[PDB]
Coordinates of C-alpha atoms and ligand atoms in Angstrom, one line a residue:
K1 CA 23.2 37.2 90.6
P2 CA 21.7 40.6 91.6
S3 CA 20.6 40.8 95.3
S4 CA 20.1 43.3 98.1
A5 CA 23.0 41.6 99.9
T6 CA 25.5 42.1 97.0
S7 CA 27.7 45.3 97.1
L8 CA 27.3 48.4 95.0
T9 CA 29.3 48.3 91.8
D10 CA 32.3 50.7 91.8
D11 CA 30.5 53.0 89.4
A12 CA 27.3 53.2 91.5
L13 CA 29.3 53.6 94.7
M14 CA 31.4 56.5 93.1
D15 CA 28.1 58.1 91.7
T16 CA 26.5 58.0 95.1
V17 CA 29.6 59.4 96.8
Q18 CA 29.9 62.1 94.1
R19 CA 26.3 63.1 94.3
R20 CA 26.3 63.6 98.1
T21 CA 29.7 65.3 98.1
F22 CA 28.6 67.6 95.4
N23 CA 25.6 68.4 97.6
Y24 CA 28.0 69.7 100.3
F25 CA 28.9 72.5 98.0
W26 CA 25.5 72.9 96.3
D27 CA 23.0 72.6 99.0
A28 CA 25.2 73.5 102.0
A29 CA 26.9 76.6 100.4
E30 CA 26.9 79.6 102.7
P31 CA 23.7 81.4 101.4
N32 CA 25.0 85.0 101.2
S33 CA 28.2 84.5 99.3
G34 CA 27.5 81.2 97.6
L35 CA 31.0 80.0 98.7
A36 CA 32.1 76.9 100.5
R37 CA 31.7 76.9 104.3
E38 CA 35.0 76.2 106.1
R39 CA 33.1 73.8 108.4
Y40 CA 29.6 72.3 108.7
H41 CA 28.4 70.4 111.8
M42 CA 25.3 68.2 111.7
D43 CA 25.2 68.5 115.6
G44 CA 25.0 72.3 115.4
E45 CA 27.8 73.0 117.9
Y46 CA 30.6 75.3 116.8
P47 CA 33.3 75.7 119.5
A48 CA 36.0 77.2 117.3
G49 CA 34.3 79.3 114.6
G50 CA 30.9 79.1 112.8
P51 CA 29.6 77.8 109.6
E52 CA 29.1 81.3 108.1
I53 CA 32.9 81.5 107.6
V54 CA 33.8 80.8 103.9
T55 CA 37.2 79.6 102.7
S56 CA 38.9 80.8 99.6
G57 CA 40.9 77.6 98.8
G58 CA 38.0 75.3 99.8
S59 CA 35.8 77.3 97.5
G60 CA 38.2 76.6 94.6
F61 CA 37.9 72.9 95.2
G62 CA 34.1 73.3 95.5
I63 CA 33.7 75.2 92.3
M64 CA 35.5 72.3 90.6
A65 CA 33.1 69.8 92.3
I66 CA 30.3 72.0 91.0
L67 CA 31.8 71.9 87.4
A68 CA 31.7 68.1 87.7
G69 CA 28.0 68.3 88.7
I70 CA 27.0 70.6 85.8
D71 CA 28.9 68.2 83.4
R72 CA 27.0 65.2 84.7
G73 CA 23.6 67.0 84.8
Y74 CA 23.3 67.0 88.6
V75 CA 22.0 70.6 88.1
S76 CA 21.1 72.4 84.9
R77 CA 23.5 74.6 82.9
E78 CA 21.3 77.6 83.8
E79 CA 21.3 76.7 87.5
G80 CA 25.1 76.1 87.3
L81 CA 25.7 79.5 85.7
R82 CA 23.6 81.3 88.3
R83 CA 25.8 79.8 91.0
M84 CA 29.0 80.7 89.3
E85 CA 27.7 84.3 88.8
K86 CA 26.9 84.5 92.6
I87 CA 30.4 83.2 93.6
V88 CA 32.2 85.5 91.1
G89 CA 30.0 88.5 92.3
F90 CA 31.2 87.9 95.9
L91 CA 34.8 87.6 94.8
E92 CA 34.5 91.0 93.0
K93 CA 33.3 92.7 96.2
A94 CA 34.9 90.8 99.1
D95 CA 38.2 91.8 100.8
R96 CA 41.3 91.4 98.6
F97 CA 45.0 92.1 99.3
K98 CA 47.2 93.0 96.3
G99 CA 44.7 91.0 94.2
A100 CA 45.2 87.9 96.4
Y101 CA 42.4 86.6 98.6
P102 CA 42.4 85.9 102.4
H103 CA 42.1 82.4 103.7
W104 CA 38.7 83.2 105.2
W105 CA 35.9 85.7 105.0
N106 CA 32.6 86.0 106.9
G107 CA 30.3 85.0 104.0
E108 CA 27.6 87.4 105.4
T109 CA 29.9 90.5 105.3
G110 CA 32.7 89.9 102.6
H111 CA 35.2 90.9 105.3
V112 CA 38.3 89.0 106.1
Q113 CA 38.1 86.6 109.0
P114 CA 41.6 86.5 110.5
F115 CA 43.2 83.4 111.8
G116 CA 45.1 84.7 114.7
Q117 CA 46.2 88.3 115.1
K118 CA 48.6 88.8 112.2
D119 CA 47.1 86.6 109.5
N120 CA 44.4 89.2 108.4
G121 CA 45.5 89.8 104.8
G122 CA 46.3 87.9 101.7
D123 CA 47.1 84.2 101.7
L124 CA 48.7 83.3 98.4
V125 CA 48.5 79.5 98.9
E126 CA 44.8 79.7 99.3
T127 CA 44.6 82.2 96.3
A128 CA 46.4 79.6 94.3
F129 CA 43.8 76.9 95.2
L130 CA 41.0 79.3 94.4
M131 CA 42.5 80.2 91.0
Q132 CA 43.2 76.6 90.1
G133 CA 39.4 76.1 90.4
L134 CA 38.5 79.4 88.7
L135 CA 40.7 78.8 85.7
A136 CA 39.0 75.4 85.1
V137 CA 35.6 77.1 85.0
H138 CA 37.0 79.7 82.6
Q139 CA 38.0 76.9 80.2
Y140 CA 34.6 75.1 80.7
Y141 CA 32.8 78.3 79.7
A142 CA 35.3 79.8 77.1
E143 CA 33.2 78.4 74.2
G144 CA 29.8 78.4 76.0
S145 CA 26.8 80.6 75.8
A146 CA 27.1 84.4 75.6
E147 CA 26.2 84.5 79.3
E148 CA 28.8 81.8 80.3
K149 CA 31.4 83.6 78.2
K150 CA 30.6 86.8 80.0
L151 CA 31.2 85.0 83.3
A152 CA 34.5 83.6 82.0
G153 CA 35.6 87.2 81.2
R154 CA 34.9 88.3 84.8
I155 CA 37.0 85.3 86.0
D156 CA 39.8 86.3 83.6
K157 CA 39.8 89.8 85.1
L158 CA 40.1 88.4 88.7
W159 CA 43.0 86.2 87.5
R160 CA 44.7 89.2 85.9
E161 CA 44.4 91.2 89.1
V162 CA 46.3 88.8 91.3
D163 CA 49.8 90.4 92.0
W164 CA 51.9 87.3 92.5
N165 CA 55.1 89.4 92.0
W166 CA 54.1 91.6 95.1
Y167 CA 54.4 88.5 97.3
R168 CA 58.1 88.2 96.4
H169 CA 58.7 90.7 99.3
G170 CA 60.8 93.2 97.3
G171 CA 61.7 91.0 94.3
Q172 CA 63.3 88.1 96.1
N173 CA 63.5 84.7 94.3
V174 CA 60.8 83.1 96.5
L175 CA 57.1 83.5 97.3
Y176 CA 55.8 84.4 100.8
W177 CA 52.6 82.8 102.0
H178 CA 51.1 85.9 103.6
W179 CA 50.9 89.7 103.4
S180 CA 48.9 92.1 105.7
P181 CA 48.1 95.8 105.2
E182 CA 48.5 96.2 108.9
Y183 CA 51.3 93.7 109.7
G184 CA 53.2 93.6 106.4
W185 CA 55.5 90.7 106.1
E186 CA 55.6 89.8 109.8
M187 CA 54.1 86.3 109.3
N188 CA 57.4 85.8 107.4
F189 CA 56.8 82.4 105.7
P190 CA 58.8 81.9 102.5
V191 CA 57.5 78.8 100.8
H192 CA 60.0 76.0 100.1
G193 CA 59.1 72.5 98.8
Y194 CA 58.1 69.8 98.9
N195 CA 54.7 70.4 100.5
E196 CA 51.1 71.1 99.2
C197 CA 51.9 74.4 97.6
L198 CA 53.3 73.6 94.1
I199 CA 50.3 75.0 92.2
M200 CA 51.1 78.4 93.8
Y201 CA 54.5 78.6 92.0
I202 CA 53.0 77.3 88.8
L203 CA 50.2 79.9 88.8
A204 CA 52.7 82.6 89.7
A205 CA 54.8 81.7 86.7
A206 CA 51.7 81.4 84.6
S207 CA 50.3 84.9 85.3
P208 CA 50.2 87.0 82.1
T209 CA 50.1 90.2 84.2
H210 CA 52.1 89.9 87.4
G211 CA 54.0 86.7 86.8
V212 CA 57.4 85.9 88.3
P213 CA 60.7 84.7 86.7
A214 CA 61.6 81.0 86.7
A215 CA 64.3 81.8 89.3
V216 CA 61.5 82.2 91.9
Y217 CA 60.7 78.5 91.4
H218 CA 64.2 77.2 91.0
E219 CA 65.7 79.1 94.0
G220 CA 62.6 79.5 96.2
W221 CA 60.5 76.3 95.8
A222 CA 63.2 73.9 94.8
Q223 CA 66.2 75.6 96.6
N224 CA 68.6 74.9 93.7
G225 CA 67.9 71.2 93.7
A226 CA 67.7 70.7 97.5
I227 CA 64.1 69.6 96.9
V228 CA 65.6 66.4 95.4
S229 CA 66.4 63.9 98.2
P230 CA 65.7 60.2 97.4
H231 CA 65.0 58.1 100.5
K232 CA 62.7 55.2 101.7
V233 CA 59.8 55.4 104.1
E234 CA 57.9 52.2 105.0
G235 CA 60.2 50.5 102.4
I236 CA 58.9 52.7 99.6
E237 CA 61.0 55.2 97.5
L238 CA 60.2 58.9 97.7
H239 CA 62.3 61.1 95.4
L240 CA 61.6 64.5 97.0
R241 CA 62.7 66.3 100.2
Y242 CA 59.5 66.7 102.3
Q243 CA 59.2 69.8 104.4
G244 CA 59.5 69.0 108.1
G245 CA 60.4 65.3 107.7
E246 CA 60.6 62.1 105.6
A247 CA 57.1 62.3 104.3
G248 CA 53.9 64.2 105.0
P249 CA 50.1 64.1 105.3
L250 CA 48.4 62.6 102.3
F251 CA 46.7 65.8 101.1
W252 CA 50.2 67.0 99.9
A253 CA 49.7 64.4 97.1
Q254 CA 46.4 65.9 96.2
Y255 CA 45.6 69.7 96.4
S256 CA 48.1 70.9 93.7
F257 CA 47.0 68.0 91.5
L258 CA 43.2 68.7 91.2
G259 CA 43.8 70.7 88.0
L260 CA 47.5 70.2 87.4
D261 CA 47.6 66.7 85.8
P262 CA 50.3 64.5 87.4
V263 CA 50.1 61.8 84.7
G264 CA 53.1 62.1 82.5
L265 CA 54.2 65.2 84.4
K266 CA 58.0 65.8 84.9
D267 CA 60.5 68.6 85.4
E268 CA 64.1 69.1 86.5
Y269 CA 63.3 67.9 90.1
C270 CA 61.1 64.9 89.4
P271 CA 60.8 62.4 86.5
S272 CA 57.2 61.6 87.3
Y273 CA 54.9 63.6 89.7
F274 CA 52.4 60.8 89.3
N275 CA 54.8 58.1 90.5
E276 CA 56.0 60.3 93.5
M277 CA 52.4 61.0 94.6
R278 CA 51.4 57.4 94.1
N279 CA 54.3 56.3 96.3
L280 CA 53.4 58.9 98.9
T281 CA 49.9 57.3 99.0
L282 CA 51.4 53.9 99.3
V283 CA 53.7 54.9 102.2
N284 CA 50.5 56.1 104.0
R285 CA 48.7 52.9 103.2
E286 CA 51.7 50.8 104.3
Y287 CA 52.1 52.6 107.7
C288 CA 48.3 51.9 108.4
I289 CA 48.6 48.2 107.5
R290 CA 51.7 47.9 109.7
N291 CA 49.7 49.7 112.5
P292 CA 52.5 49.9 115.1
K293 CA 50.2 51.7 117.6
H294 CA 47.6 48.9 117.4
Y295 CA 44.7 51.2 116.6
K296 CA 41.4 49.4 116.0
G297 CA 40.3 48.9 112.3
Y298 CA 43.5 50.0 110.5
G299 CA 44.3 47.7 107.6
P300 CA 44.2 47.2 103.8
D301 CA 40.5 48.2 103.7
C302 CA 40.9 51.1 106.1
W303 CA 43.8 53.5 105.8
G304 CA 44.5 57.2 105.1
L305 CA 46.1 59.6 107.4
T306 CA 46.0 63.4 106.7
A307 CA 45.2 66.8 108.4
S308 CA 41.6 66.8 109.6
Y309 CA 39.6 67.1 112.7
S310 CA 40.9 64.8 115.4
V311 CA 39.6 63.3 118.7
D312 CA 41.4 66.1 120.6
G313 CA 40.5 69.0 118.1
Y314 CA 42.3 69.2 114.8
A315 CA 45.7 67.6 113.9
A316 CA 48.1 67.1 111.0
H317 CA 47.9 63.3 111.0
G318 CA 50.5 61.5 108.9
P319 CA 52.2 58.1 108.5
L320 CA 54.6 58.4 111.4
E321 CA 53.9 57.2 115.0
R322 CA 54.3 60.7 116.4
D323 CA 51.6 62.0 114.1
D324 CA 49.2 59.1 114.3
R325 CA 46.3 59.8 116.8
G326 CA 44.1 56.8 115.8
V327 CA 42.1 58.9 113.4
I328 CA 41.3 57.9 109.8
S329 CA 40.2 60.7 107.4
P330 CA 38.1 59.4 104.4
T331 CA 39.5 62.2 102.1
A332 CA 43.1 60.7 102.4
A333 CA 42.6 57.3 100.6
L334 CA 39.6 58.5 98.5
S335 CA 41.2 61.6 97.0
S336 CA 44.1 59.3 96.0
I337 CA 41.8 57.2 93.8
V338 CA 43.7 58.6 90.8
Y339 CA 47.0 57.1 92.0
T340 CA 45.9 53.9 93.7
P341 CA 42.3 53.1 92.3
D342 CA 41.9 49.5 93.5
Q343 CA 43.1 50.4 97.0
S344 CA 41.1 53.6 97.3
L345 CA 38.0 51.8 96.0
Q346 CA 38.5 49.1 98.7
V347 CA 38.6 51.8 101.4
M348 CA 35.5 53.5 99.8
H349 CA 33.4 50.3 99.9
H350 CA 34.5 49.6 103.5
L351 CA 33.7 53.1 104.7
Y352 CA 30.3 53.0 103.0
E353 CA 29.6 49.7 104.8
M354 CA 30.2 51.3 108.2
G355 CA 26.9 53.2 107.5
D356 CA 25.4 56.4 108.9
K357 CA 28.1 56.9 111.5
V358 CA 30.6 57.6 108.7
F359 CA 28.6 58.3 105.5
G360 CA 26.3 61.2 106.0
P361 CA 23.9 63.4 103.9
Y362 CA 26.7 65.3 102.2
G363 CA 29.1 62.3 101.9
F364 CA 31.7 60.9 104.2
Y365 CA 32.2 62.8 107.4
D366 CA 35.6 64.4 108.1
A367 CA 37.4 61.8 110.3
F368 CA 36.7 59.0 112.8
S369 CA 38.5 56.9 115.4
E370 CA 37.2 53.4 116.0
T371 CA 39.6 53.1 118.9
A372 CA 38.1 56.2 120.6
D373 CA 34.5 55.5 119.5
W374 CA 34.7 58.9 117.9
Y375 CA 32.4 59.6 114.9
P376 CA 31.7 63.3 114.4
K377 CA 28.9 64.2 112.0
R378 CA 31.0 67.1 110.7
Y379 CA 32.4 68.2 107.4
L380 CA 35.2 70.5 106.2
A381 CA 35.3 72.1 102.6
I382 CA 39.0 71.3 102.2
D383 CA 38.5 67.6 102.9
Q384 CA 35.2 67.3 101.0
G385 CA 36.3 69.0 97.7
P386 CA 39.1 66.7 96.8
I387 CA 37.0 63.6 97.1
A388 CA 34.5 64.9 94.5
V389 CA 37.1 66.3 92.2
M390 CA 39.5 63.4 92.3
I391 CA 36.7 60.8 91.7
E392 CA 35.8 62.9 88.6
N393 CA 39.4 63.1 87.4
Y394 CA 39.7 59.3 87.7
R395 CA 36.4 58.7 85.9
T396 CA 36.7 61.3 83.0
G397 CA 39.8 63.5 83.6
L398 CA 37.5 66.6 83.5
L399 CA 39.3 69.0 85.8
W400 CA 42.7 68.0 84.4
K401 CA 41.6 68.5 80.8
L402 CA 40.1 72.0 81.6
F403 CA 43.0 73.3 83.7
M404 CA 45.7 72.0 81.4
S405 CA 43.9 73.6 78.4
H406 CA 44.4 77.1 79.8
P407 CA 47.0 78.9 77.6
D408 CA 48.5 80.8 80.6
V409 CA 48.9 77.6 82.6
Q410 CA 50.7 76.1 79.6
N411 CA 53.0 79.1 79.3
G412 CA 53.8 78.9 83.1
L413 CA 54.6 75.2 82.8
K414 CA 56.9 75.8 79.9
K415 CA 58.7 78.7 81.7
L416 CA 59.4 76.5 84.7
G417 CA 60.7 73.6 82.7
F418 CA 57.8 71.1 83.0
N419 CA 57.1 68.6 80.3
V420 CA 54.2 66.2 79.7
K421 CA 55.0 62.7 78.2
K422 CA 52.1 60.4 78.7
Ligands
LIG1 K1 23.4 45.0 95.1

């Protein structure tokens, strides 16, 4: 029987979450650039950087959330195209470093906003998240209007300009995260797996202009098979060697899989990316259900530990006592809806039922601690984007279908030894 006291259906709940989370990128875009704000605080207080700072990677997630919105008629095609034109216009004029983008710009100036003294140039991980988004928009518009196709061409030129091979630091068989015109290679961070950065290696192999040999992946990312290290965490099998420990924060299951489709995905180092990321999600869920630190509210209907704002600032929360600060981040469980739908939907209903303190005007706020009575009315692009995109991927497979249709992406996957058997 229908009633005001009966719960939203899953579909109406997901619709509502998607509309609001889309509105984060649509209504709360930085007005000058059109890009995703790194952070947005309903309380108006910004102790560690303002809302005018725009994030390259977060904007990549956001443009995918916006694609989802165009496809559902949240906004018109025409409105959608005008936004894409604005975003691409900014990218064509903002600071770039060997065709890669910085982590942050000031949206009002187009100039790099450093994090700390030496990280004032290119960030290739962020570039990779931006490009994963941009290549999906290219495919959405490849057979569109003359105007949409024009925009797609401008994206293809940005894509072509990224010099992935530069970031090998003199032709080494690995990718470095950063490069600065001023400080060069001093950040010195070669990127080895497993962590959130797979899509970087895949896009580097995919580039039809400044692409890298397969050796860069096999030796650099996978370290000649060292990336394979089967072990159990919370009684659950993980196949991969996780950087810095036995597992990691849940976003590692998510960022590189917004456009790259994990379903039926395999390569030399993993017989199913889907199964691995599902199990990572289940390790996270299991730690929260066990709740060894006796935090309030953890359980089957409330789990999900990842990097986010935290009671004492910002922390890389994860399913290990050391990393558990009593803070649940909605993006963790919700962005894993593709891997664990029933379980992620249980969390989504339960969080929605907490009301205003957790579910705000642009969707779920970043993080909360029931134990600490800590409920910030604050958002981050990088936590918001994956909720909208992964809900869509579960519902229609939109972003996967678009990304995976890109002929360069296909060639990069073939070159690295990936196969898809669904
Ligand atoms: K109802």
